[PDB]
């Protein structure tokens, strides 16, 4: 129901952001929260019929608006590194606004420079013949490496259709350089399938990794390719052997 | 006007009894709530209770609005792996002009660990479909009591345990992935800092 | 069945007063929101001192009621109600003692819509001073009533009239008093 | 010590159309019962009675509203919370100010017409300026209660937080007859008696 755009955002300290919220039809109460590991859920403000009913304890640079159709927009000007959080939006049908329906959120990352933004390199690792022999089960591993920030979405595709069964991706990414605040990340995922499924070349296995980087609107002074939002993928074909 | 709830990340086995403590301190009339945040999404209402003695019930979870102890303790008889999420306790207090404001507690992460039926611990080597040169080590089918340890070695990378459900086979299997830019690195060496089982199958 | 009845009564209409938001305790109005001034008006000072009411609550309820009015003008295919004429009574607050200050009450009751013109007349002449009035007070039958007040000093060589005007009246109605 | 509100639910001779609302809280034996009324002109078309626990279309003009609101557990649970929320809250604000407001009645006995003490006359007991409205006004002729010939105006609200009542007896006064009007009210610790002597 509750929609929020953009899903992921990378900004430089000092810039400004506008985050939109489309509440459920016909919820007129719209609440905004900032979610941080440090401070948890922090109330920003709530709107009902264009007016800001309540406000939390955030500086004037954190402003919001609500339109006639109940859609809301929040703005954060003069961005700081500490503004990096999940900007949750919640709508309520009940006009008192207690029973809230939360949006997926806008993941905002505020950086000093965009010089350390890297897309992932993705590789598919074909199952072990040993595993197939010993278990009659075939696990495919996918590695997404050297990406910054962790604004990534990994998925498995078998014959051009998304697969959820026999899958599991790391709940959290891995720091390639643990002792580093700007450390690039790594992420693994597994796809387990039957040996009868793997031992068929008709089956095409794709590991899709959606990266969320820089837009067409972002400045790119570095020599390397612009680390734009892109899909980096790797593939493997079912092996008869 | 605050919500005080159970600290740190609760980790329970599948089918276990869960208690997520929540106490409130508020201005005479609050309504009480339990919000659930599943990995990757926003909050979702689980349970609520308007007045004292009201019981919130959903997904096999229950919390009673207890005025005597000023609490909304979340309980579940037998937790499912699907319950792994972050639980938030909340208050609803009047905030003028017929409006109410939610006051959340600092979230409680819960990791529900599946009970592994026929463990076959093993550490396999998987070769890259692109280059034969590149390979990963996969420690799979191990028991849930087995705790995968991080890399003591600098240029070595080991992932935490991850459970995959093969639904059509009603099969769940824990797995960890180790990799390194060589040359001292081998799959036998891979999970050395980790206290792997005695039964572990290492083929050659 | 009740020991007390605490009620919020509100209306919204095309003609003046365009809206009214009020609260009554046991049929007597305790407070209301001046919709123009955006502030709570208490009936007795002892109420304003003991309690508070954020006027935004009133304005918010009136805005909803204006939305609701619009939807119902449509739904009813622009149904305008019959103009129910008022029943007017004039009576003093205190027993009449010639020379002793008193208050003449004019009770304009059982009318609909709450669109009314009321003037006090002393010896056929309009009285502009020592005059007060109620809001358009609600009735359980969704009709209205109103109280008009006049502080006067009773004298045998003086008469009073409460000249009321309503749409349900063919001509202004004068209710005479001693 | 703040008054709490419930936001009315959203729906959807000179030309005039009116919409009225009513949010009534009935306090009794520690309980609260809430009645939310939606009235187009003088027609209450849809209502919420806390005792019913759901919206009901008083007339068929409220059928879409009854249908819609009852399909919304969020609106139903919000309206159901009203008796124990705003009704209870607002009731509990009022200490000895509204719930225990007491204004003593002023009592005046005067005959309707002046003249000889033998004929038919009305003796008026004008009880004025009291609060609450519950009052007992008795008539006595030489210490014995007169029940017959008692013409009462019944409770008159002045709209200024005071009441009045005119209780009059049909009397045929003989010289030396003692007429006594006795008023009993919560603001009075003992009955207030005002006498009229025949003359
Ligand atoms: C409004 O008029 C239409 C005919 O044009 C009719 O179908 C409808 O029932 C009317 N509604 C009311 C409430 O009069
Ligand atoms: C009230 O008075 C004004 C001025 O005389 C007039 O225009 C209006 O129509 C009146 N209506 C009634 C009946 O109250
Ligand atoms: C008041 O409520 C109690 C239950 O709480 C009941 O026993 C009693 O009879 C009630 N009294 C009246 C006057 O209804
Ligand atoms: Be309501
Ligand atoms: Na409501």
């Amino acid at each position: 129901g509750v929609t929020q755009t953009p899903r992921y955002l990378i900004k430089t300290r000092g810039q400004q952001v506008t985050l939109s919220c489309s509440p459920i039809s016909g919820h007129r109460s719209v609440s905004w929260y900032q979610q941080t590991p440090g401070q948890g859920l922090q109330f920003l403000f709530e709107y009902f019929s264009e007016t800001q009913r309540n406000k939390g304890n955030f500086p004037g640079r954190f402003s919001g608006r609500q339109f006639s159709n109940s859609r809301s927009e929040m703005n954060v000007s003069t961005l700081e590194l500490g503004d990096s959080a999940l900007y949750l939006c919640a709508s309520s049908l009940a006009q008192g606004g207690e029973t809230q329906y939360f949006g997926p959120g806008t993941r905002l990352l505020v950086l000093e420079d965009l010089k350390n933004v890297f897309p992932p390199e993705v590789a598919v690792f074909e199952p072990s013949e040993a595993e197939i022999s010993h278990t009659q089960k075939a696990t495919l591993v996918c590695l997404a490496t050297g990406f910054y920030p962790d604004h990534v979405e990994l998925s498995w595709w078998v014959n051009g259709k998304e697969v959820h069964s026999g899958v599991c991706t790391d709940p959290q990414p891995l720091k390639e350089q643990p002792a580093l605040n700007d450390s690039r990340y790594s992420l693994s995922s597994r796809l387990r399938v039957s040996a009868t499924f793997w031992q068929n070349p008709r089956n095409h296995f794709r590991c899709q990794v959606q990266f969320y980087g820089l837009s067409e609107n972002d400045e790119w002074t570095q020599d390397r390719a612009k680390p734009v939002t892109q899909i980096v993928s790797a593939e493997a074909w079912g092996r008869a052997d | 006007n605050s919500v005080t709830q159970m600290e740190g990340p609760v980790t329970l086995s599948e089918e276990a009894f869960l208690t997520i403590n929540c106490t409130y301190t508020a201005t005479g009339y609050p309504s009480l709530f339990w919000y659930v945040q599943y990995p990757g999404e926003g909050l979702q209402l689980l349970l609520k209770a308007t007045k004292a003695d009201d019981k919130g019930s959903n997904k096999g979870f229950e919390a009673t609005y207890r005025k005597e102890t000023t609490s909304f303790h979340l309980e579940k008889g037998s937790v499912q792996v699907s319950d792994s999420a972050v639980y938030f306790c909340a208050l609803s207090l009047y905030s003028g002009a017929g409006s109410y404001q939610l006051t959340f507690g600092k979230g409680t992460k819960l990791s529900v660990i599946p009970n592994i039926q026929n463990p076959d611990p093993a550490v396999y080597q998987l070769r890259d479909s692109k280059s034969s040169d590149k390979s990963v080590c996969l420690f799979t089918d191990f028991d849930s009591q087995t705790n995968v340890s991080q890399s003591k070695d600098s240029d070595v990378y080991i992932t935490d345990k991850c459970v995959l459900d093969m639904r059509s086979m009603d099969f769940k299997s824990n797995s960890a992935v180790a990799w390194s830019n060589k040359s001292d690195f081998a799959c036998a060496n891979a999970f050395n800092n980790s206290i792997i089982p005695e039964d572990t199958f290492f083929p050659s | 069945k009740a020991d007390h009845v605490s009620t919020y009564a509100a209306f919204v209409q095309t003609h003046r007063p365009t809206g009214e938001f009020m609260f009554e305790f046991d049929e007597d109005e305790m407070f209301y929101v001046d919709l123009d001034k955006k502030e709570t008006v208490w009936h007795l000072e002892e109420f304003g001192q003991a309690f508070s009411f954020e006027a935004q609550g009133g304005l918010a309820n009136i805005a909803i009621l204006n939305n609701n009015l619009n939807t119902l003008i449509q739904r009813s295919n622009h149904t305008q109600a019959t103009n129910d004429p008022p029943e007017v009574t004039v009576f003093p607050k205190e027993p009449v003692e010639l020379g002793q200050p008193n208050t003449l009450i004019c009770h304009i009751d059982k009318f609909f819509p709450p669109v009314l013109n009321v003037t006090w007349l002393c010896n056929g002449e309009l009285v502009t001073e020592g005059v007060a009035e109620s809001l358009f007070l609600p009735r359980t039958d969704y009709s209205f009533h109103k109280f008009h007040y006049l502080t006067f000093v009773p004298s045998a060589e003086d008469f009073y009239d409460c000249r009321v005007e309503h749409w349900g009246l063919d001509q202004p109605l004068l209710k005479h008093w001693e | 010590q703040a008054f709490w509100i419930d936001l009315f639910e959203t729906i959807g001779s000179p030309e005039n159309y009116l919409f009225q609302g009513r949010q009534e809280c009935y306090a009794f034996n520690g309980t609260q019962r809430f009645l939310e009324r939606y009235i187009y002109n003088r027609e209450e078309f849809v209502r919420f009675d806390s005792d019913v626990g759901e919206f009901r279309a008083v007339t068929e003009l409220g059928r879409p509203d009854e249908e819609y609101w009852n399909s919304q557990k969020d609106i139903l649970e919000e309206e159901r919370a009203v008796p124990d929320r705003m009704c209870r809250h607002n009731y509990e604000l009022g200490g000895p100010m509204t719930l225990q407001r007491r204004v003593q009645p002023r009592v005046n006995v005067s005959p309707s017409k002046k003249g000889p003490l033998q004929h038919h006359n009305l003796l008026v007991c004008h009880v004025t300026d009291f609060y609450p409205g519950s009052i007992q006004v008795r008539w006595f002729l030489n210490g014995q209660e007169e029940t017959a010939g008692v013409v009462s105006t019944n409770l008159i609200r002045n709209g200024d937080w005071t009441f009045q009542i005119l209780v009059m007896l049909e009397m045929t006064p003989q010289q030396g007859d003692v007429y006594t009007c006795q008023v009993e009210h919560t603001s009075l610790d003992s009955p207030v008696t005002v006498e009229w002597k025949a003359q």
Side-chain angles (χ1 to χ4, degrees), chain A residues 1-6 8-114 116-128 130-131 134-160 162-171 173-179 181-198 200-216 218 220-240, chain B residues 1-66 68-105 107-126 128-144 146 148-149 151 153-154 156-160 162-166 168-191 194-197 200-203, chain C residues 2-97 99-170 172-178, chain D residues 2-72 74-98 101-105 107-112 115-116 118 120-174 176-196 198:
Chain A
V2 178
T3 47
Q4 277 184 262
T5 61
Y8 294 90
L9 219 49
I10 309 151
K11 288 269 153 179
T12 306
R13 44 127 76 114
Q15 295 194 275
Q16 88 171 336
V17 282
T18 301
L19 323 168
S20 286
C21 188
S22 285
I24 292 174
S25 316
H27 292 206
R28 281 186 310 261
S29 174
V30 181
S31 297
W32 286 97
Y33 302 88
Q34 188 203 57
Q35 193 177 51
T36 288
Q39 38 271 354
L41 278 156
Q42 294 296 292
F43 179 70
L44 275 153
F45 19 73
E46 100 93 18
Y47 299 79
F48 182 78
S49 295
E50 302 190 46
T51 121
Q52 191 196 98
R53 286 220 207 107
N54 295 89
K55 182 155 246 176
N57 42 246
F58 273 83
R61 47 189 194 90
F62 293 84
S63 72
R65 80 199 136 280
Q66 177 180 50
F67 310 101
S68 300
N69 45 69
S70 293
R71 294 182 220 278
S72 178
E73 278 187 357
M74 80 156 291
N75 187 96
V76 194
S77 61
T78 179
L79 284 164
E80 299 183 12
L81 302 170
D83 297 358
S84 289
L86 216 228
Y87 288 87
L88 287 161
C89 175
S91 79
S92 173
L93 183 70
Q95 290 176 150
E98 305 167 76
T99 328
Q100 283 166 31
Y101 300 81
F102 285 77
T106 296
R107 187 139 281 296
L108 175 73
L109 189 72
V110 205
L111 264 10
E112 280 172 330
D113 54 87
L114 272 33
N116 214 274
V117 174
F118 294 103
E121 281 173 273
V122 348
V124 170
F125 298 85
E126 295 182 297
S128 186
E131 181 197 353
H134 184 28
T135 61
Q136 292 300 322
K137 284 190 198 74
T139 315
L140 284 127
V141 173
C142 181
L143 266 187
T145 52
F147 60 98
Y148 194 92
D150 79 288
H151 292 28
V152 131
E153 288 174 353
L154 198 153
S155 46
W156 286 95
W157 300 78
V158 190
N159 291 135
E162 200 177 348
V163 159
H164 304 275
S165 179
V167 181
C168 101
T169 306
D170 302 317
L174 221 61
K175 340 59 48 213
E176 285 192 340
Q177 284 285 294
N181 14 107
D182 45 21
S183 175
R184 298 198 290 163
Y185 299 90
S186 300
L187 180 73
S188 79
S189 181
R190 289 125 279 228
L191 163 68
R192 227 229 275 258
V193 97
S194 72
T196 53
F197 198 93
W198 170 257
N200 168 214
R202 251 156 288 223
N203 296 137
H204 188 200
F205 303 92
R206 179 161 174 165
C207 175
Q208 201 107 297
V209 162
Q210 169 74 78
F211 176 73
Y212 293 93
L214 266 68
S215 314
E216 295 192 295
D218 293 90
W220 199 254
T221 51
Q222 303 247 296
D223 297 355
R224 64 182 175 89
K226 200 200 274 188
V228 281
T229 295
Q230 61 189 100
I231 293 163
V232 186
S233 76
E235 53 173 28
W237 292 85
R239 200 165 284 198
Chain B
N1 293 345
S2 75
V3 175
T4 287
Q5 76 177 86
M6 198 167 99
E7 16 51 45
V10 42
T11 326
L12 296 177
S13 301
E14 194 179 350
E15 326 231 320
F17 193 104
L18 173 255
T19 84
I20 311 173
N21 292 261
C22 176
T23 188
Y24 69 85
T25 172
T27 52
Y29 308 92
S31 273
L32 271 49
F33 310 80
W34 274 103
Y35 277 88
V36 58
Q37 173 167 46
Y38 293 106
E41 46 209 75
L43 279 72
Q44 179 184 8
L45 181 83
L46 173 72
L47 255 66
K48 56 172 185 158
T50 311
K51 50 169 266 74
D53 309 318
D54 285 1
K55 192 170 131 188
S57 302
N58 173 271
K59 293 165 158 78
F61 283 94
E62 59 234 299
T64 295
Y65 192 149
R66 214 87 240 283
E68 13 281 303
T69 53
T70 77
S71 67
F72 204 45
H73 301 319
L74 185 74
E75 280 189 344
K76 199 181 183 149
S78 131
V79 294
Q80 292 172 83
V81 200
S82 57
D83 297 314
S84 310
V86 25
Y87 298 79
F88 295 90
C89 192
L91 275 183
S92 172
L93 294 148
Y94 192 86
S95 57
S99 77
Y100 296 85
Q101 194 183 251
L102 288 174
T103 311
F104 299 95
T108 308
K109 190 189 187 285
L110 165 79
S111 292
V112 184
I113 261 71
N115 301 315
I116 278 152
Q117 193 196 328
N118 323 314
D120 215 91
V123 2
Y124 314 115
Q125 196 178 270
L126 281 80
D128 185 347
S129 56
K130 179 255 291 173
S131 289
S132 301
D133 187 91
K134 315 288 179 290
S135 80
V136 295
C137 297
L138 166 83
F139 176 36
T140 193
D141 304 25
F142 58 80
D143 192 71
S144 271
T146 319
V148 177
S149 313
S151 64
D153 202 316
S154 317
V156 168
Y157 316 110
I158 307 154
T159 74
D160 49 22
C162 183
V163 51
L164 62 94
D165 193 347
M166 276 184 76
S168 189
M169 274 184 167
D170 193 5
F171 176 87
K172 285 178 204 170
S173 70
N174 281 337
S175 30
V177 178
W179 75 99
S180 182
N181 248 64
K182 279 200 275 81
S183 284
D184 205 304
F185 190 80
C187 293
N189 164 232
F191 312 91
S194 185
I195 307 153
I196 61 120
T200 337
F201 167 85
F202 288 77
Chain C
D3 309 325
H4 301 283
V5 188
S6 300
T7 154
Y8 281 110
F11 73 68
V12 121
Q13 74 179 344
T14 120
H15 285 63
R16 291 211 222 193
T18 257
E20 191 182 290
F21 182 88
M22 60 156 272
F23 175 84
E24 64 176 343
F25 181 81
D26 277 344
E27 277 281 301
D28 287 298
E29 174 257 321
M30 163 134 69
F31 65 89
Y32 74 89
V33 175
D34 192 291
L35 308 175
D36 302 282
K37 287 186 148 228
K38 291 165 165 232
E39 242 298 89
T40 307
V41 181
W42 298 88
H43 208 123
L44 314 177
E45 240 194 63
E46 54 255 45
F47 291 8
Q49 296 162 348
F51 323 107
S52 71
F53 179 77
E54 176 191 345
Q56 187 49 31
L59 283 358
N61 263 336
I62 287 302
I64 286 157
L65 260 36
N66 270 123
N67 181 104
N68 294 10
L69 207 216
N70 291 334
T71 314
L72 276 99
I73 290 164
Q74 275 326 111
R75 190 185 290 169
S76 69
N77 294 340
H78 295 239
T79 291
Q80 175 161 0
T82 167
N83 296 318
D84 297 307
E87 162 161 34
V88 184
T89 315
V90 191
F91 58 93
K93 173 167 163 63
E94 262 82 65
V96 305
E97 300 221 290
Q100 277 175 257
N102 210 308
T103 301
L104 245 199
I105 311 156
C106 186
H107 184 48
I108 317 108
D109 197 1
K110 296 142 172 79
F111 67 92
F112 190 90
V115 189
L116 204 76
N117 291 326
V118 179
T119 55
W120 277 113
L121 298 166
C122 183
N123 307 333
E125 246 63 76
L126 224 299
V127 317
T128 49
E129 67 165 58
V131 177
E133 69 188 61
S134 85
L135 298 163
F136 285 94
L137 304 166
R139 284 175 55 86
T140 58
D141 68 350
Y142 321 112
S143 199
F144 294 92
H145 76 292
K146 202 176 174 209
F147 294 93
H148 271 256
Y149 306 89
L150 171 62
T151 53
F152 76 108
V153 28
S155 159
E157 282 306 291
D158 280 309
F159 65 67
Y160 298 91
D161 294 310
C162 188
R163 201 229 192 192
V164 343
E165 292 197 271
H166 193 266
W167 299 337
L169 249 30
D170 300 81
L173 180 77
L174 283 84
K175 199 84 179 251
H176 194 100
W177 194 88
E178 200 232 76
Chain D
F3 275 98
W4 287 7
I5 67 128
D6 179 70
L7 290 167
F8 280 102
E9 311 319 316
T10 292
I11 297 165
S13 170
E15 193 184 349
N16 193 63
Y17 322 107
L18 177 140
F19 195 101
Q20 254 179 99
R22 229 65 127 216
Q23 281 165 331
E24 312 154 14
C25 298
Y26 296 91
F28 182 85
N29 197 27
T31 209
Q32 285 286 346
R33 178 187 179 175
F34 176 76
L35 271 104
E36 190 179 63
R37 303 180 205 265
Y38 297 90
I39 306 120
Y40 180 60
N41 292 319
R42 291 190 64 178
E43 194 188 333
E44 184 197 344
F45 61 93
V46 67
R47 177 209 309 227
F48 178 88
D49 197 326
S50 83
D51 257 43
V52 174
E54 57 186 61
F55 296 85
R56 294 274 181 264
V58 185
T59 78
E60 292 304 87
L61 181 71
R63 181 50 174 174
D65 327 293
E66 188 213 322
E67 277 189 22
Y68 176 73
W69 296 319
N70 293 339
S71 77
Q72 303 301 333
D74 284 354
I75 291 159
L76 251 36
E77 283 303 305
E78 205 196 53
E79 223 74 52
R80 287 158 180 168
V82 181
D84 305 301
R85 267 217 231 104
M86 73 133 216
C87 293
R88 205 212 294 165
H89 179 80
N90 302 344
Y91 194 65
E92 271 148 41
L93 302 173
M97 188 37 56
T98 51
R101 172 183 156 93
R102 263 96 247 253
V103 185
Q104 285 180 343
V107 188
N108 189 273
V109 177
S110 183
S112 183
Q118 277 282 54
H120 293 292
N121 199 9
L122 229 39
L123 184 67
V124 192
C125 185
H126 202 161
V127 183
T128 233
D129 304 333
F130 61 93
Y131 196 93
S134 222
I135 203 136
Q136 290 182 67
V137 185
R138 289 166 207 267
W139 266 119
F140 291 101
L141 181 47
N142 314 317
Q144 280 81 68
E145 201 197 343
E146 297 282 90
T147 54
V150 179
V151 21
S152 186
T153 62
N154 289 336
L155 202 53
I156 307 155
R157 194 176 289 265
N158 298 317
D160 60 357
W161 286 76
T162 72
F163 296 83
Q164 67 165 288
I165 195 154
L166 288 96
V167 185
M168 50 231 267
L169 62 40
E170 278 144 34
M171 57 155 200
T172 179
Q174 298 309 291
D177 267 8
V178 194
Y179 287 96
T180 308
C181 179
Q182 175 201 64
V183 357
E184 280 133 306
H185 189 256
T186 46
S187 72
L188 306 166
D189 306 291
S190 59
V192 161
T193 81
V194 178
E195 260 183 46
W196 159 262

